[PDB]
Amino acid sequence: SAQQELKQRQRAEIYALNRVMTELEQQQFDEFCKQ
Amino acid sequence: LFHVNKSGFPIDSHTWERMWLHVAKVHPRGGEMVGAIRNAAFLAKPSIPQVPNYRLSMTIPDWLQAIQNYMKTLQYNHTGTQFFEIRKMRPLSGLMETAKEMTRESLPIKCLEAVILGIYLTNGQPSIERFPISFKTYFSGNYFHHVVLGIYCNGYYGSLGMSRRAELMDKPLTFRTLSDLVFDFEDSYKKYLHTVKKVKIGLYVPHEPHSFQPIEWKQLVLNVSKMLRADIRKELEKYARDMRMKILKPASAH
């Protein structure tokens, strides 16, 4: 199914994007618990 | 920001493109970051976690933790784009459909989606009462809105939820009173320098996943930043007492 394939690529892109953005937030949170 | 997916799944070009635009602005590495994901020849496929099932070997706390562990594995959603449209004044029936779809698509969630997933996943332990606890907080010139699923079972209070912060979501079933639970969140917010402005407690959520009743989200509204703590306690215990031993008519009705 095209739609199933697209939904698997979108899911892998979402979780790749998510870990990047969680890492950004945790650095900026940590660096704020500094300053 | 305030981007919510209203196209279902697969996500549509407009929402997808709007997602990548937003994160290109927020992330220091900008387009190198986006381009590197979107042009990947091949992406490792994230494993799909099984939906918890209640087992005879589990205590109630085991079951709540199993549910909470499922949500943590879904991951808190930091993409800017909420993937499941929650229309919280929907009848429980429609929200329970959106919850099963969270289970099927298996993407990251934020706090309101998590509340709805907790209801869905506990709609079958009737000794588990569920009720939304909402917060309005202030921090550094801005207001914030957060919600968790309060639970009450066998004389104790706890909660399920999702949040960036590990101290603003799940709480075990060891709080003897509603006040103790709410004050723990308030003290958890103090750590992050958030002042609580408003606390709103809902009604018990009916256990019928086919109900046409909406969740009542604002049965009790406390302007806590303007109240002394003893009066917060008196109000919360009076209302907790009510919901343990009454059938309160939804405030949103009368």
Residue numbers in the entry:
A (entry chain B): 26 to 60
B (entry chain A): 48 to 301
Give the original sentences from the paper that presented this experimental model:
In this cycle, the C-terminal tyrosine is removed by tubulin carboxypeptidase (TCP) and can be religated by tubulin tyrosine ligase (TTL). VASH2 possesses a non-canonical Cys-His-Ser catalytic architecture. SVBP plays a chaperone-like role by extensively interacting with VASH2 and stabilizing the α1- and α2- helices.
VASH2 alone is poorly soluble; here, we co-expressed full-length VASH21–355 and SVBP1–66 from Mus musculus in Sf9 insect cells. The crystal structure of the VASH21–355/SVBP1–66 heterodimer was determined in the space group C2221 at a resolution of 2.5 Å using iodide-based single-wavelength anomalous diffraction. Poor electron density of some residues of VASH2 (1–48 and 300–355) and some residues of SVBP (1–25 and 61–66) are unable to be generated a well-built model, indicating they are likely to be flexible. To improve the structure resolution, we prepared a complex of N-terminal truncated VASH247–355 and the full-length SVBP1–66 for crystallization, and determined the crystal structure of the VASH247–355/SVBP1–66 heterodimer at 2.2 Å resolution by molecular replacement using the VASH21–355/SVBP1–66 structure as search model. These two structures are almost identical, with a root mean square deviation (RMSD) of 0.28.
